[PDB]
Amino acid sequence: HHHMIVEERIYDLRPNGAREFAQHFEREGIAIQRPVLGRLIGYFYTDIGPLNQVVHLWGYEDLEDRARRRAILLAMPEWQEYVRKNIQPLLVRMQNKILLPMSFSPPLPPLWQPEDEHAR
Amino acid sequence: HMIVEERIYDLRPNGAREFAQHFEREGIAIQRPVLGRLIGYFYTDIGPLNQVVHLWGYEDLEDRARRRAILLAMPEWQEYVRKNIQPLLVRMQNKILLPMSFSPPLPPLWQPEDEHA
Amino acid sequence: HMIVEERIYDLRPNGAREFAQHFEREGIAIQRPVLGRLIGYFYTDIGPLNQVVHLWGYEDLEDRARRRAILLAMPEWQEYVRKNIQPLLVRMQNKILLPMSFSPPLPPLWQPEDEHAR
Amino acid sequence: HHHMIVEERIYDLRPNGAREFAQHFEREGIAIQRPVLGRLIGYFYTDIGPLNQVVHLWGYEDLEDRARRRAILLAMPEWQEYVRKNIQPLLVRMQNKILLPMSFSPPLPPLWQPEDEHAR
Amino acid sequence: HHHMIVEERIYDLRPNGAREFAQHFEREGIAIQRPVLGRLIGYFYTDIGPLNQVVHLWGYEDLEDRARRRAILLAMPEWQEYVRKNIQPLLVRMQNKILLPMSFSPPLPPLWQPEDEHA
Amino acid sequence: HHHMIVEERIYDLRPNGAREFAQHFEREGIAIQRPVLGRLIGYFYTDIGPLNQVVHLWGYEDLEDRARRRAILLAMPEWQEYVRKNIQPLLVRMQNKILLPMSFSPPLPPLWQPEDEH
Amino acid sequence: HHHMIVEERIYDLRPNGAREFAQHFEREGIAIQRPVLGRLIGYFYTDIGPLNQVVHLWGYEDLEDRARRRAILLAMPEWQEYVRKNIQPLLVRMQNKILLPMSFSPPLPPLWQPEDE
Amino acid sequence: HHHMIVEERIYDLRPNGAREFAQHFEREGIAIQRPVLGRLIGYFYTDIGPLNQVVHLWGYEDLEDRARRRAILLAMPEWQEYVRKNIQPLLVRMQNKILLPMSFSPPLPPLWQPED
């Protein structure tokens, strides 16, 4: 897997907040974020377990790759405003982990290309 | 209308190395053809340590129940767990995740050709 | 193939009184006929406080899926939750429980006759 | 509800211990415990959530009733031996809660009778 | 111990809230609550550990005694309003447990008397 | 309260371990510990909530007074061997907190005297 | 180490509040607090793990001097007003621990001096 | 701070296990580990809070240097056996966090040298 890593991000939201969260991301947010970060493995909300939670997993070639990409995203005024206006009010708690794939785990997703965005 | 189960096992200290070794040598060849859609199998490097995290795709919760029941009843799987994984386990939990509209689609079922390759 | 869903809600401090009042006055008449088999609806006196605990029985997973989908699509339920219950909520969790062989069978389905006899 | 109370007991077990736990109770333990305590509302193991967990709810007419029935159970040599031999090795953590029914919650299960035990 | 019990209540407060919580009980709240419940073993705030936390231990003869006295307290409008106005804005999370004394643990205090309120 | 402090120590034990724990401290443990540390406010085990837990509260003049007395107890071979033989096998988790009494909270108990032990 | 002690304070903040927290401390707050408490070993915010969290470690000669210095800090209206206006709205949860250094851990750092400010 | 990071590692130990833990690290372990990782900011055990816990903070120039140096330590048989024999029996739970220093936080300490 050549030092590939996966960041799992886990956000606890205000009660019944996941629906608006996903609405913002599908309409606006994921077009900002996915081209920059690159390799979305999955973006979910919880149905059974800890409720009002969003779970998303992103693949990077290594930690440096993650660092460079998250800094580019963080420096985007469009991203900053999008979060401030739409997502910030829904947040309660945030946690992340760095996950390393076992040898039989699937390979990294390919990088999101602008043709993928046009295909949505 | 796919669903994803996330299973989160906390292991005994420094037990992730052996845990992965058993699954590559023997365990995943039993488990993956039965459950069908492995999205990711990981161990933590930063955060809660000595933890393995695995995400399994199913068409719905009934599909999950049937497939897990098939696995659970296999003596090969039972023996595999007893002899190799059971002593490694400390805590287990799971959650059911629902993909957002832009999240990647339901993967194909693991095939015999995938194993032999 | 019976399953029981346990739902555990942590409320804002001292919020259970209003929570149960809403469900007595309005809420349970909406929810219980749809979901079908209430096993119990409680609040805590010892343990984690400002917590409500409710268990709902279903014949199977698909029975749960269909009945919860009906409930959540009802605009009367959506508005009830939003106006009365959502401001009292702090945290929500649920578990899927499977009954051991000796555990009681499912309650019968809630009938209009039951609602009328309240 | 005439001061009715419900005790929820939540036991976390050794990994994959619920099967043996259930076996011991269906074969032997519940025949001891249910007639003494009186009103089993439900006895479960988890399938989604915290795994290796058993959840059981017992109904009592009031706090005196619960104390009296539990004291009788704890004093029984048969119960003490059954727990020590069969259940004690499977236990990791135990918690309980005292629950109060809302007005619309079902009434107490009837007391378990010998006629119930015989036709199990 | 003649089979007495102790209830430990643990309240997590909004940040830096314990000083005001303590002031409300010193000026007003404990005069309402302590004569009704009976036997305050201790009322504390945390300095090391979980911060912004108050811990209080109440003695009772048994769980039925506890439920009778707490019912009396909760029915009092003066208590309900004292809590609602002053304490409720400070609360974040609440928990309790029932503790049984070991045989060498001290006896539980006598009941709070009106002479104690006036002293 | 003259800067009085209280330490609450919370020990989670192996299941059904509190009975044996209490027996050991009744017969021998508390006779070593209480004179040295001085002011036992309460020593309990849990009945409802987190089960298999012991909770004990000790009063001190300050955190230095806590440090000196605990340092004395910890150095005692009699206490080291009692804990190793009888208590250590029963322990699962240990935590402690420093609590400050509110103005209306009772005063600290007096120092345990040898007369008390008699 | 002659009974040197370290206090670790752990604050969970409102989401995305660490940036404002650090800004208030770099511009105003740390100039009040550090000269009084004396020995800042580290002030951090989390990047991986529990997010929106600030971790800070304060060294003291002992718990008596910790108490004396913290009581001085807390009685300062400048500190009180700084916290009420700038930090209070950002706080969600606070915890602390008392840590004892192992023999090989770095020694007690020197007091922060006006020349350092 | 030039992208410096700090790793905080938090180990929960078996009851009363911190004394033996420290003894091994002072007698044998920290001689192995510190020269390799380079920048120990602090190595502690708890006295008040969660008990039977050791907390240690390691400085790194960035996560890339962290990964390089930890990979070097992990591959050392001397470290592997030291851990397996002496420390693993004391461990119950492990967690870690990546901490970023604020502008006023102390700088990256120097690398540990064989003279030290």
Q: Does D5 touch chain C (CB under 8 A)?
A: yes
Query: Does the domain at residues G1-117 carry the CATH identifier 3.30.70.100?
Result: yes
Phi, psi of F48 (to 5 degrees): -135, 135
CB-CB neighbors (< 8 A) of A97 in chain G: 48-49
- Please tell me whether residue G60 adopts helix, strand or coil conformation: strand
CB-CB neighbors (< 8 A) of H83 in chain B: 14
Note whether G104 and H27 are within 8 A (CB): no
Give partners of A (≥3 CB pairs < 8 A). Answer: B, C, D, G, H
Q: Which of D7, D35, D39, D5 is nearest to D110 (CA)?
A: D39
CB-CB neighbors (< 8 A) of C96 in chain D: 46-49
Inter-chain residue contact H16 with F93, CB threshold 8 Å: no
Q: For chain D, how long is the longest CA-to-CA vector?
A: 41
Inter-chain residue contact D100 with C40, CB threshold 8 Å: no
Note whether B11 and A55 are within 8 A (CB): no
DSSP state of E15: T
Q: Does D47 touch chain A (CB under 8 A)?
A: no
Distance CA E10, CA E58 (A): 12
**Gap between the terminal Cα atoms of chain D:** 29
Q: Which of G21, G64, G70, G76 is nearest to G44 (CA)?
A: G21
C-alpha distance from G50 to closest chain A C-alpha (Å): 5
Q: Which residue of D has its CA nearest to A49?
A: D49
Q: How is residue G45 written in tokens?
A: 């915010």
Q: How is residue B30 written in tokens?
A: 């039993």
Q: Give the residue carrying structure tokens 């073993």.
A: E41
H1-116 has which fold? Alpha-Beta Plaits (3.30.70)
F·G CB contacts under 8 A: 11
Residues 6 or more apart whose CB falls under 8 angstroms from that of F98 comprise E46, E47, E48, E49, F5, F6, F7, F63, H48
Q: How is residue F41 written in tokens?
A: 């406010």
Note whether G99 and G8 are within 8 A (CB): yes
Residues 6 or more apart whose CB falls under 8 angstroms from that of F30 comprise E104, F40, F43
Q: Which of H23, H3, H4 is nearest to H13 (CA)?
A: H23
Q: Which of C7, C27, C31 is nearest to C18 (CA)?
A: C27
DSSP state of G109: P
Distance CA C90, CA C13 (A): 9
Q: For chain E, how long is the longest CA-to-CA vector?
A: 41
Measured CA distances, A28 to A13, A17, A18, B102 (Å): 19, 17, 15, 11
Note whether D117 and D35 are within 8 A (CB): yes
Q: Which of E11, E38, E8, E6 is nearest to E22 (CA)?
A: E11
Distance CA A57, CA C70 (A): 31
Q: Does G48 touch chain B (CB under 8 A)?
A: yes
Annotate chain B with three-state secondary structure: CCEEEEEEEEECCCCHHHHHHHHHHHHHHHHHHHHCCEEEEEEEEECECCEEEEEEEECCHHHHHHHHHHHHCCHHHHHHHHHHHHHHEEEEEEEEEEECCCCCCCCCCCCHHHHHC
- Please tell me whether residue A45 adopts helix, strand or coil conformation: strand
Q: Does E99 touch chain C (CB under 8 A)?
A: no
Query: Buried (b) or exposed (e) across E72-100, using 16+ Cβ within 10 A?
Result: ebeeeeebeebbeebbeebbbbbbbbbbb
Return the sign of the alpha-carbon dihedral for residues C15, C18, C22, C25: positive
Annotate F57-90 with three-state secondary structure: EEEECCHHHHHHHHHHHHHCHHHHHHHHHHHHHH
**What's the CA angle centered on E78, arms E75 and E82, to 5 degrees?**
110
DSSP state of E90: G
Residues 6 or more apart whose CB falls under 8 angstroms from that of B42 comprise A6, A99, A100, A101, A102, A105, B52, B53, B54
**What's the CA angle centered on B67, arms B8 and B37, to 5 degrees?**
60
Q: What contacts 24+ positions apart, CB below 8 Å, involve C107-111?
A: C107/C37, C107/C38, C107/C39, C107/C57, C107/D106, C108/C37, C109/C36, C109/C37, C110/C32, C110/C33, C110/C36, C110/C37, C110/C38
Interface of E with F in 55-94 (CB under 8 A): 55, 57
Q: Which residue of E has its CA nearest to D65?
A: E64
Inter-chain residue contact H15 with F94, CB threshold 8 Å: yes
Q: How is residue G78 written in tokens?
A: 């400048």
DSSP code string of chain H: -TT-EEEEEEEEESTT-HHHHHHHIIIIIHHHHHHHH--EEEEEEEEESBSSEEEEEEEESSHHHHHHHHHHHHT-HHHHHHIIIIIGGGEEEEEEEEEEE-TTSPPPPPPP-TT-
Note whether C80 and C26 are within 8 A (CB): yes
Nearest to A105 among B4, B42, B99 (CB): B42
CB-CB neighbors (< 8 A) of A34 in chain B: 102
Distance CA D45, CA A48 (A): 15
Distance CA G11, CA C70 (A): 43
Residue of D70, D80, D82, D96 best to disrupt the F interface, most CBs of F under 10 A:
D96
Distance CA F74, CA F83 (A): 10
Q: Does D19 touch chain B (CB under 8 A)?
A: no
Q: Which of A9, B82, G4 is nearest to F67 (CA)?
A: G4
Read off the amino acid at residue A1: H
- Please tell me whether residue G77 adopts helix, strand or coil conformation: helix
Query: Does the domain at residues F1-118 carry the CATH identifier 3.90.1150.10?
Result: no
CB-CB neighbors (< 8 A) of C37 in chain D: none
Q: Give the residue carrying structure tokens 């709810």.
A: D57
DSSP state of G87: I
Measured CA distances, A96 to C48, C50, F44, F55, G13 (Å): 27, 29, 38, 34, 15
Q: Give the residue carrying structure tokens 């969660």.
A: H50
C-alpha distance from C28 to closest chain E C-alpha (Å): 26
Helix (H) or strand (E) holding E57: strand E53-60
Q: What contacts 24+ positions apart, CB below 8 Å, involve B108-116?
A: B108/B37, B109/B36, B109/B37, B110/B32, B110/B33, B110/B36, B110/B37, B110/B38, B112/B33, B115/B29, B115/B32, B115/B33
Distance CA H101, CA G54 (A): 10
CB-CB neighbors (< 8 A) of H30 in chain G: 102, 104
Q: Which of C13, G26, A49 is nearest to D53 (CA)?
A: A49
Distance CA E78, CA E73 (A): 9
For chain D, count helices (H), then strands (E). Answer: 5, 4
Q: Does D48 touch chain B (CB under 8 A)?
A: yes
Residues 6 or more apart whose CB falls under 8 angstroms from that of A58 comprise A6, A7, A9, A37, A38, A39, A40, A41, A66
Experimental method: X-ray
Residues 6 or more apart whose CB falls under 8 angstroms from that of G74 comprise G80
Q: Which residue of C has its CA nearest to B1?
A: C65
Inter-chain residue contact F51 with D95, CB threshold 8 Å: yes
Strand partners, D12: D53, D93
Nearest to C96 among D48, D100, D109 (CB): D48
Distance CA B4, CA C108 (A): 32
Distance CA H37, CA H6 (A): 12
- Answer whether C touches G (≥3 Cβ pairs < 8 Å): no
Residues 6 or more apart whose CB falls under 8 angstroms from that of A57 comprise A6, A7, A8, A9, A40, A41, A42, A43, A99, B40, B55
Strand partners, A61: none
Distance CA E105, CA F55 (A): 11
Inter-chain residue contact E62 with D62, CB threshold 8 Å: no
Q: Give the residue carrying structure tokens 């059911």.
A: B96
Cβ count within 10 A of residue H9: 15
For residue B81, the Cα-to-chain-centroid distance in whole angstroms is 13
DSSP code string of chain C: --EEEEEEEEESTT-HHHHHHHIIIIIHHHHHHHH--EEEEEEEEESBSSEEEEEEEESSHHHHHHHHHHHHH-HHHHHHIIIIIGGGEEEEEEEEEEE-TTSPPPPPPP-HHHHHT-
Give partners of B (≥3 CB pairs < 8 A). Answer: A, C, D, G, H
DSSP code string of D4-42: -EEEEEEEEESTT-HHHHHHHIIIIIHHHHHHHH--EEE
Strand partners, G101: H44
- Answer whether B touches C (≥3 Cβ pairs < 8 Å): yes
- The CATH number given to E1-119 is 3.30.70.100
Q: Which residue of H has its CA nearest to B48?
A: H95
- Please tell me whether residue A21 adopts helix, strand or coil conformation: helix
Measured CA distances, H57 to D50, H10, H30 (Å): 32, 9, 13
C-alpha distance from G25 to closest chain H C-alpha (Å): 9
Give partners of E (≥3 CB pairs < 8 A). Answer: C, D, F, G, H
Distance CA D61, CA D39 (A): 9
- The CATH number given to D1-120 is 3.30.70.100
Resolution in A: 1.6
Inter-chain residue contact H102 with G49, CB threshold 8 Å: no
Read off the amino acid at residue G72: I
Q: Which of H95, H73, H93 is nearest to H83 (CA)?
A: H73
Query: Buried (b) or exposed (e) across H102-116, using 16+ Cβ within 10 A?
Result: beebeebeeebeeee
- Please tell me whether residue G10 adopts helix, strand or coil conformation: strand
Residue of D63, D74, D97 best to disrupt the E interface, most CBs of E under 10 A:
D63
